[PDB]
Amino acid sequence: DKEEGGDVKAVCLTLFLLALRARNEHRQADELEAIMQGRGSGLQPAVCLAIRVNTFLSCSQYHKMYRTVKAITGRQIF
DNA sequence: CGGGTTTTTGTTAAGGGCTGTATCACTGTGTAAGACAGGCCAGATC
C-alpha cells in the first residue's frame, strides 16, 4: 500500500521468484513464470512425428511413452 | 538549452552449482559365381 498501492500480487510473485533463483532453482522458477501466463505448452504433430522418426522409435514404444507421460503429468505434451 | 533528482545497469575484489560440449576409441553397411589357360586321357587315324 505504501509504494505499490495494493499490488500484493506482483510483489509477492517477484519475491518468490527471487527466493527460487537464490537457491539455484532456475527450472522451477521458469516453469512458474511460464504457467503464470496460463498457456498450454503443447507440441505440433509434425514435431512429434520428426522426434519419433529421427530417434528410431516404433509406434508401440512411442505409444507407451505417450501414455506414461499423459498419465503421470496429467496433460498432453505429445 | 542546463542543475537537481529519479530510475534501471555495470561491476570484479572471489567462490558454488547446474548445464552444455569436446574427447576417446571403436562400430555397422560394402560378402557368389563366371572367365580362362594349362594338363591329361579316350580316341579317330594314315
Least Cα distance to A75 among A67, A63, A11 occurs for: A67
Resolution (A): 3.2
Question: And the C-alpha cell for A6?
Answer: 495494493
CA of A78 to C1' of B28 (A): 32
CA of A14 to C1' of B9 (A): 19
Strands (E) in chain A, as ranges, are none
Greatest CA separation for chain A: 61
Chain B bases near protein Cβ (<7 Å): 16-19
Give the rounded distance of the alpha carbon of A18 from its chain centre. 19
The Cα–Cα gap between A78 and A69 comes to 8
Least Cα distance to A78 among A49, A43, A51 occurs for: A43
